[PDB]
Amino acid sequence: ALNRGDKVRIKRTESYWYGDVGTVASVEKSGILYPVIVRFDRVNYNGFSGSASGVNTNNFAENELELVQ
Amino acid sequence: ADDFANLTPCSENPAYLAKSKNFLNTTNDPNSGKIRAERYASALCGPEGYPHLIVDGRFTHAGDFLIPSILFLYIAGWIGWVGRSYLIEIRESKNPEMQEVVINVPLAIKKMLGGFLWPLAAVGEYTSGKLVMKDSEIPTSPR
Amino acid sequence: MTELSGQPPKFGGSTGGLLSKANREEKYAITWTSASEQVFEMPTGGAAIMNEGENLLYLARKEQCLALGTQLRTKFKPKIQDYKIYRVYPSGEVQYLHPADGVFPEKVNEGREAQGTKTRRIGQNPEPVTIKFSGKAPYEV
Amino acid sequence: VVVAFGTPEKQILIEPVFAQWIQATSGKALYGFDVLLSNPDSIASTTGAAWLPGWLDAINSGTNSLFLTIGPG
Amino acid sequence: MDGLKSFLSTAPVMIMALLTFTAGILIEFNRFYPDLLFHP
Amino acid sequence: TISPPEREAKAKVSVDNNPVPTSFEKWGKPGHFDRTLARGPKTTTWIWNLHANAHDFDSQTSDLEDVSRKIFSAHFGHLAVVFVWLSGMYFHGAKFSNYEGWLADPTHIKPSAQVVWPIVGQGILNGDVGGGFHGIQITSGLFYLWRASGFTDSYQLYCTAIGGLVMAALMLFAGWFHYHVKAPKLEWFQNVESMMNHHLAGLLGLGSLGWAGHQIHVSMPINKLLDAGVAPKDIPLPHEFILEPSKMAELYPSFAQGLTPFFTLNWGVYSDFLTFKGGLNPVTGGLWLSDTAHHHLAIAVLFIIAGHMYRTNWGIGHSMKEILEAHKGPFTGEGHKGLYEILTTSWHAQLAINLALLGSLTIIVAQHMYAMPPYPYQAIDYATQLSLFTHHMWIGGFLIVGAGAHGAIFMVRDYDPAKNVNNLLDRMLRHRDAIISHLNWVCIFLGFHSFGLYIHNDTMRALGRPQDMFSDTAIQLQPIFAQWVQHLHTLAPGATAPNALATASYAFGGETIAVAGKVAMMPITLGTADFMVHHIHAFTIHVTALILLKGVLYARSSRLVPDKANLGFRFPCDGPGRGGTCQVSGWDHVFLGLFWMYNSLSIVIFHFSWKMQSDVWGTVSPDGSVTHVTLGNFAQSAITINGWLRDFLWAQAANVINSYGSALSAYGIMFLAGHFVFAFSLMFLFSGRGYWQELIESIVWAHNKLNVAPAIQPRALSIIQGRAVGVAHYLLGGIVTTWAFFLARSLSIG
Amino acid sequence: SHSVKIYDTCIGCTQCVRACPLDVLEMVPWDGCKAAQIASSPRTEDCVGCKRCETACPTDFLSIRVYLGAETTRSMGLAY
Ligand code: CLA
Ligand code: CLA
Ligand code: CLA
Ligand code: CLA
Numbered sequence A: 001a002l003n004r005g006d007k008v009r010i011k012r013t014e015s016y017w018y019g020d021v022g023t024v025a026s027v028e029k030s031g032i033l034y035p036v037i038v039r040f041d042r043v044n045y046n047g048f049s050g051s052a053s054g055v056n057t058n059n060f061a062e063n064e065l066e067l068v069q
Numbered sequence B: 001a002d003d004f005a006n007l008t009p010c011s012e013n014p015a016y017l018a019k020s021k022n023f024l025n026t027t028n029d030p031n032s033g034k035i036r037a038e039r040y041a042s043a044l045c046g047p048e049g050y051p052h053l054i055v056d057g058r059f060t061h062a063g064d065f066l067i068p069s070i071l072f073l074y075i076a077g078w079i080g081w082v083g084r085s086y087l088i089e090i091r092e093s094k095n096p097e098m099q100e101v102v103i104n105v106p107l108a109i110k111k112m113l114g115g116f117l118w119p120l121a122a123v124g125e126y127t128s129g130k131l132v133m134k135d136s137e138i139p140t141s142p143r
Numbered sequence C: 001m002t003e004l005s006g007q008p009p010k011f012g013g014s015t016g017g018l019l020s021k022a023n024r025e026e027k028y029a030i031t032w033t034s035a036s037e038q039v040f041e042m043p044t045g046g047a048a049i050m051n052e053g054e055n056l057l058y059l060a061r062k063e064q065c066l067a068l069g070t071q072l073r074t075k076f077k078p079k080i081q082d083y084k085i086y087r088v089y090p091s092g093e094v095q096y097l098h099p100a101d102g103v104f105p106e107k108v109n110e111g112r113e114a115q116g117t118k119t120r121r122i123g124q125n126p127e128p129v130t131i132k133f134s135g136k137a138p139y140e141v
Numbered sequence D: 001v002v003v004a005f006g007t008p009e010k011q012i013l014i015e016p017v018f019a020q021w022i023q024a025t026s027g028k029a030l031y032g033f034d035v036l037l038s039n040p041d042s043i044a045s046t047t048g049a050a051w052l053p054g055w056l057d058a059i060n061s062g063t064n065s066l067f068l069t070i071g072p073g
Numbered sequence E: 001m002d003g004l005k006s007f008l009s010t011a012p013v014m015i016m017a018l019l020t021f022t023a024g025i026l027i028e029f030n031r032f033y034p035d036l037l038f039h040p
Numbered sequence F: 001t002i003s004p005p006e007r008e009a010k011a012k013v014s015v016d017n018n019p020v021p022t023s024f025e026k027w028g029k030p031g032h033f034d035r036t037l038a039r040g041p042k043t044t045t046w047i048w049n050l051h052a053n054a055h056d057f058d059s060q061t062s063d064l065e066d067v068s069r070k071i072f073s074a075h076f077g078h079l080a081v082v083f084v085w086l087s088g089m090y091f092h093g094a095k096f097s098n099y100e101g102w103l104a105d106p107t108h109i110k111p112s113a114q115v116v117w118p119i120v121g122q123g124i125l126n127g128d129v130g131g132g133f134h135g136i137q138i139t140s141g142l143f144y145l146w147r148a149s150g151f152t153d154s155y156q157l158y159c160t161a162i163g164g165l166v167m168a169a170l171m172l173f174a175g176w177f178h179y180h181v182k183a184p185k186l187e188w189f190q191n192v193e194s195m196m197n198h199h200l201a202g203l204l205g206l207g208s209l210g211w212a213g214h215q216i217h218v219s220m221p222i223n224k225l226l227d228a229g230v231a232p233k234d235i236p237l238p239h240e241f242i243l244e245p246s247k248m249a250e251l252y253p254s255f256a257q258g259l260t261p262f263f264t265l266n267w268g269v270y271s272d273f274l275t276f277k278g279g280l281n282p283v284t285g286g287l288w289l290s291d292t293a294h295h296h297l298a299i300a301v302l303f304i305i306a307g308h309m310y311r312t313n314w315g316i317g318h319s320m321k322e323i324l325e326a327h328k329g330p331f332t333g334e335g336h337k338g339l340y341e342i343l344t345t346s347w348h349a350q351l352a353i354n355l356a357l358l359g360s361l362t363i364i365v366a367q368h369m370y371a372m373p374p375y376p377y378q379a380i381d382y383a384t385q386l387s388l389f390t391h392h393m394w395i396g397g398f399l400i401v402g403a404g405a406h407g408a409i410f411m412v413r414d415y416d417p418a419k420n421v422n423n424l425l426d427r428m429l430r431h432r433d434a435i436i437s438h439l440n441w442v443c444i445f446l447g448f449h450s451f452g453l454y455i456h457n458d459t460m461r462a463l464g465r466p467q468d469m470f471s472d473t474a475i476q477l478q479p480i481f482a483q484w485v486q487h488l489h490t491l492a493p494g495a496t497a498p499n500a501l502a503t504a505s506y507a508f509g510g511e512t513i514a515v516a517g518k519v520a521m522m523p524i525t526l527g528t529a530d531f532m533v534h535h536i537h538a539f540t541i542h543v544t545a546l547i548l549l550k551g552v553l554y555a556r557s558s559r560l561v562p563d564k565a566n567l568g569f570r571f572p573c574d575g576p577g578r579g580g581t582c583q584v585s586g587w588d589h590v591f592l593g594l595f596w597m598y599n600s601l602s603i604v605i606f607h608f609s610w611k612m613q614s615d616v617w618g619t620v621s622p623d624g625s626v627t628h629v630t631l632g633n634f635a636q637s638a639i640t641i642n643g644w645l646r647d648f649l650w651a652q653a654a655n656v657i658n659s660y661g662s663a664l665s666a667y668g669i670m671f672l673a674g675h676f677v678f679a680f681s682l683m684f685l686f687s688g689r690g691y692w693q694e695l696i697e698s699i700v701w702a703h704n705k706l707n708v709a710p711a712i713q714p715r716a717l718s719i720i721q722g723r724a725v726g727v728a729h730y731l732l733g734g735i736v737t738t739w740a741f742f743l744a745r746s747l748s749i750g
Numbered sequence G: 001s002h003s004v005k006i007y008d009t010c011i012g013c014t015q016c017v018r019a020c021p022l023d024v025l026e027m028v029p030w031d032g033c034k035a036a037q038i039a040s041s042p043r044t045e046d047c048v049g050c051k052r053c054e055t056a057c058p059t060d061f062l063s064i065r066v067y068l069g070a071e072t073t074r075s076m077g078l079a080y
């Protein structure tokens, strides 16, 4: 029940953004475990040692989110 | 009562009164040593000739700790409050990180010059609810 | 597999190659065809000249073979994608390793089995208090 | 920095009041806070305690390690 | 031009200008009124 | 920018007209030189990586023609920096010193060229050096240089500072010009034959030529009067000597003949100022300037002649390519083939040679200045002697490790295996294990047979067994070779050097020269305590060479990592696998070699400082006897570790800790401060960033609790940066401790 | 030998296999992601544990995990 541009809070525990709130980028069709692709304002840890930043996007599931807006 | 019996004022202390006549000069003023002899002669001293400060909370020595404590806390709250407010102000402008690396001087100065009322602003943000956050809305790690 | 045909590369010998344990315990060989005669760096040290056509070289361990393979296709315009890595036993037993099913493990391919595949998230691993005193780990179950 | 500049008269020497006062609460009179066992009129001294005369003599003799006199260091 | 006005307002230039200014303040204050172990 | 005409005359000059325009918009954009950093900071690490790659021009751009034009202007900027610094010294000597007050009575006053502002008690740092002047006693030996150069008035030093600032402006301007107006092409650079011709004939030849001319017209005729007993105000000016060439013709008998004999091959007549006396000056304790002018003239002729060996445009001359392609034997196959192309393309290949040679030559400078003091009254100033020696030791020690760094950089970035097929480099890459394991064995041997001797001596003297020690009074370890060459240099003026009147240095053997009440230089008797410490030095240098060599011979690959060349020069590891792949890159090898260079020089400088105070330096009696400071216990106490712990450290450190309340209190402060920074480095060197990032997580939660977290997400230092901060603070604290200790100790010996 | 697992959060981008230097990892057709593939680890006997796969993972936290275990001649990376 999501669309492009919704504010959702991550509830994936092990996620780097667990507790943070990101923006939905695009949702893929059915047949995928994690179709909800979310962008974030803050990069994660990803990257080799000494990297400049990280990744600010990831796929999640609907039972792992919570709309805010 | 006879609080600090082992401490005698610098005006009565033996070693302090011996050393006060032979005080060095910090600045260019040659009287600065005798200036110290006259200035520190009011504090409590020990049997070695060096002044001691009592910070247990008594008002007799409120000039020892209370005044610097208050003056610091004022200036430090000023610093932290203008920093926090400017950090929040950046969060709505273009590129929240570039303006943290390159300072918006016309904005940073405008926020610095409005910091002498940081206690009132902080209480107004706590009553309205802007000072603190909610635990259920902060990114936390797995327990 | 049946035979390891190939010409030894032009190289003046180095001390970084295989040793006594590498001949008695196990060694690795790689076979490839070169479009022409060129110079390539040795994973053990120095620069060698690969022969035109089918080549053969024996190395100590597998990572050296794969490091040479990743060099062959990336540095030269006539890229070598037919390099085949074999493990040699002390009894002459030679078996195929890389590439596995004739196709590089990069791209997908039909006819492979799911090995080490789990149907959960990492944050869904069981608690170590439930499996203690058993010879199993939170990831092995 | 203050001692190296020939000015030992500017050292921030904080008096350990909160601990010397506790010492006074057990009978140490070198500081003279007149609190509890340091005060002869506290009801803690008129209890007929058999251990009081020994403790009061042991604490204030300047020969033992029982509650040593402390300072800014 | 603004290209140099942005460089003069960078993090290191400004964080050293403030430190120099505060050093001047403290040094002049402890020149005219030194040796303030406490408040009289 | 501007537009000059052309400035060429049938030359290999090749430039590009205004390649890089002049603008300030790139100044407000930090990290623009890197593509990975231009998109904006997302973590705090982005900041660190900004400085870690500020000068690395290879990662920035791949065009070598751009990198060379960057490097040229970078050198110009460095020269501007240097000229600014030097004008600083000349101006502080002109208006903030007592050079005039020292030149009058140089044996009863101390050099000082700094005045501390009296504030918050720091005015106590102005020590009475003598003559009414109050300031910091300097140890860089600037007054001795300015006396040996002919400086006599403050206006001279003032004009020197003005000229230095003018040259700084000129170098700064030339840097901008050779990158924003007319930046040279590659045709102007890759003439290594031409560049060597010009750098030998013009730079090092004409330089010493002109300086010898200066000395003959400035330094010699004024230092001759200074050494006689004439007041500086009564001594004439240097230009009064050329305005009146008769005053120069009279002051030297050879000058009383004219200039024609030199052109008519009558050199022997100029023996009245181009002398070969040798030894030292009994008035000042330094080298004879009449010998230095002759020496600079000889070096000038030699270098100008050397600048005419390589081929340029007129056909004659050599090509280094030919010489390298010619040298090949049955042991190395093709020999030096391809080396010209290596050193004409890779800047790191060139820097790995230049840094090595420059550091070695700085060490040679220290070792030659300490024993043959070339400046007046510097051998009496033990502080200045020690300071120059140790400073030129440390500079060279750093510049040497720079070579082992840039060699690995060349290996990872510029080594083309197709260009090195069976030559020196390629064949050396083959038997890497041979050389490395042999050096491993040599280092183990030198560790057992140099340090184990000290351990054995400590255990024997501790057990109460004197007849079982390696001392001058037991199992003697006398150095025969060094004593033999000492005796050779002593008998030089009467055998293998008939024209030489005195020995090169009095350290080998001979007379004992002393100025005022202190000694300048005397024979340095070498015994067991010298043999053992020399072998200690050899061992430490061997281990440092082993480390910095395995850093280059394995930057490409190894049996552990066969694809290491892909990982680059600077990288922390390749995972905890293979048992543990931590610190395998050449960067990590330089990180390790820094510590061993420090540990080697730590024993070198202590050997110097104790041997000089024990068997050389000391007050001289009017009857003739010489009593050393530590009473000559080096030959009898420096043989055990407890001797160095007690009679060297504990004994001579007393000046630093007891310095409070005096003008040397700053040295005790910096002693404790270096002790602080040393231990501060251990926090980085012993830990790992995985703990610090987890802690930053909690502090970030705390900041977000009050909503005060920076958009620049805070990230702990990278593994490489952690190690770099660790080694940097280690070296800083150690060198600050030793600097404070050495200066406070040397200033307190009179 | 080391243990290599692949979780359902994998998007099948072959990056961990493109980074593996010992041909330990492969790619099998799956039905979870757009690419319809998931990482596989058939030849764990050649896994040294250099973590080059985990470094090259895009998902929020790893989708492939390496757990070091009983080290052997092949896992220790012994070439002598
Ligand atoms: C606006 C800036 C700002 C503000 C409001 C705060 C506020 C706070 N910090 Mg903090 N911090 C800052 C910057 C700031 N920090 C920076 C730049 C660093 C890196 C050095 C840190 C590193 C840091 C650590 C390690 C910790 C805190 C902690 C804390 C909390 C306890 C206060 C404290 O520890 O005493 C004082 C805080 C410090 C001594 C840290 C340095 C403070 C810097 C130097 C002042 C920043 C000035 C800033 C540039 C002003 C900008 C003005 C603007 C107009 C341009 C508190 C809410 C503690 C915590 O977790 O909470 C319990 C703690 O452990 N901070
Ligand atoms: C006012 C004169 C001026 C101006 C407007 C510019 C402008 C520019 N220069 Mg440039 N340059 C100048 C003078 C100038 N330069 C001089 C005098 C030199 C000789 C040293 C150079 C050598 C030079 C090189 C080699 C390069 C540039 C580059 C650039 C461009 C990017 C600069 C940058 O990264 O941000 C600004 C950088 C700084 C503000 C650095 C801060 C100063 C450092 C930290 C130390 C200062 C050393 C200084 C040169 C000497 C000290 C002076 C002495 C008194 C001690 C930019 C448009 C780069 C380019 O073209 O992009 C690819 C490039 O590679 N310049
Ligand atoms: C003229 C000599 C010379 C030159 C031209 C270079 C040039 C270069 N070196 Mg290099 N190097 C040299 C000598 C030289 N080096 C020596 C002697 C050593 C041995 C110590 C090294 C060791 C070394 C290493 C390990 C590395 C380089 C790297 C580099 C490249 C990037 C520089 C950089 O990181 O940006 C700017 C440099 C910095 C930001 C360093 C700042 C930190 C300094 C050291 C702090 C020092 C403190 C100060 C001096 C004293 C303390 C006072 C304090 C209280 C303020 C660059 C092309 C890097 C590279 O990747 O190569 C391609 C690399 O990692 N060098
Ligand atoms: C003399 C060595 C030294 C020093 C100074 C420190 C200092 C510190 N350690 Mg530490 N540590 C050390 C050795 C040292 N460690 C070693 C050898 C180990 C074993 C590897 C550890 C392991 C360790 C752990 C595991 C932890 C610490 C932590 C800390 C911090 C605790 C905060 C504090 O003390 O309050 C105040 C800070 C100080 C008193 C030090 C600051 C001193 C400077 C001079 C203040 C002024 C700043 C200066 C002017 C900057 C400008 C520089 C400019 C000149 C370029 C602190 C900064 C804990 C931490 O991170 O705190 C949360 C932590 O968990 N340490």
Ligand SMILES: CCCCCCCCCCCCCCCC(=O)OC[C@H](COP(=O)(O)OC[C@@H](O)CO)OC(=O)CCCCCCCCCCCCCCC
Residues within 6 Å of the ligand: F327, F328, F329, F330, F331, F332, F333, F334, F335, F336
């Ligand atoms: C302190 C010394 C007093 C103790 C005596 C020690 C004797 C030293 C052994 C003799 C010198 C050996 C090198 C010449 C021998 C020599 O260089 O011959 C020349 C030979 C190659 O020459 P080519 O015939 O190829 O000549 C063509 C060249 O132009 C390049 O193509 O080099 C080698 O032998 C490679 C093997 C090096 C490995 C041997 C070196 C041993 C390392 C230790 C050296 C100690 C030197 C100490 C000096 C301070």
Ligand SMILES: CC1=C(/C=C/C(C)=C/C=C/C(C)=C\C=C/C=C(C)\C=C\C=C(C)\C=C\C2=C(C)C[C@H](O)CC2(C)C)C(C)(C)C[C@@H](O)C1
Residues within 6 Å of the ligand: B055, B056, B057, B058, B065, B076, B077, B078, B079, B080, B081, B082, B084, B122, F706, F708
């Ligand atoms: C009586 C007194 C002392 C005794 C003091 C007592 C014992 C200390 C008590 C401390 C108590 C336990 C803590 C006090 C307050 C704790 C709350 C949580 C404070 C929160 C402050 C935060 C919310 C402020 C945040 C933002 C404030 C508003 C302004 C800053 O710019 C910036 C920034 C930090 C973001 C002794 C030591 C005995 C000596 C005696 O002479 C005087």
Ligand SMILES: CCCCCCCCCCCCO[C@@H]1O[C@H](CO)[C@@H](O[C@H]2O[C@H](CO)[C@@H](O)[C@H](O)[C@H]2O)[C@H](O)[C@H]1O
Residues within 6 Å of the ligand: B102, B103, B104, B105, B106, E002, E003, E005, E006, E008, E009, E013, E017, F028
């Ligand atoms: C002698 C000491 C000198 C240093 C001390 C004086 C500092 C003076 C600060 C300059 C004041 C102007 O203030 C500075 O204006 C520039 C204009 O480019 C702003 O710059 C910002 O906005 C401009 C447009 O307005 C953008 O094009 C630019 O990319 C961005 O960085 C800075 O965010 C602000 O800090």
Ligand SMILES: CC1=C(C/C=C(\C)CCC[C@H](C)CCC[C@H](C)CCCC(C)C)C(=O)c2ccccc2C1=O
Residues within 6 Å of the ligand: E015, F683, F684, F685, F687, F688, F689, F692, F715, F716, F717, F718, F719, F721, F722, F723
């Ligand atoms: C403490 C620590 C950190 C954390 C270190 C940090 C966060 C550095 C702190 C830097 C602060 C924010 C800046 C203060 C220092 C400045 C560089 C000094 C400049 C002062 C001028 C502005 C005057 C690591 O990241 C680390 C990594 C690997 C091994 C060990 C360690 C380690 O021990």
Ligand code: SF4
Residues within 6 Å of the ligand: G006, G009, G010, G011, G012, G013, G014, G015, G016, G017, G038, G039, G056, G057, G058, G059, G063, G064
């Ligand atoms: S990188 Fe990770 S998530 Fe992507 S295909 Fe490989 S194992 Fe799966």
Ligand code: SF4
Residues within 6 Å of the ligand: F577, G004, G019, G020, G021, G022, G024, G025, G046, G047, G048, G049, G050, G051, G052, G053, G054, G066
């Ligand atoms: S841990 Fe390293 S060696 Fe093992 S599968 Fe992953 S990338 Fe390959």
Ligand SMILES: [Cl-]
Residues within 6 Å of the ligand: F461, F637, F640, F641, F642, F643, F644
């Ligand atoms: Cl001893």
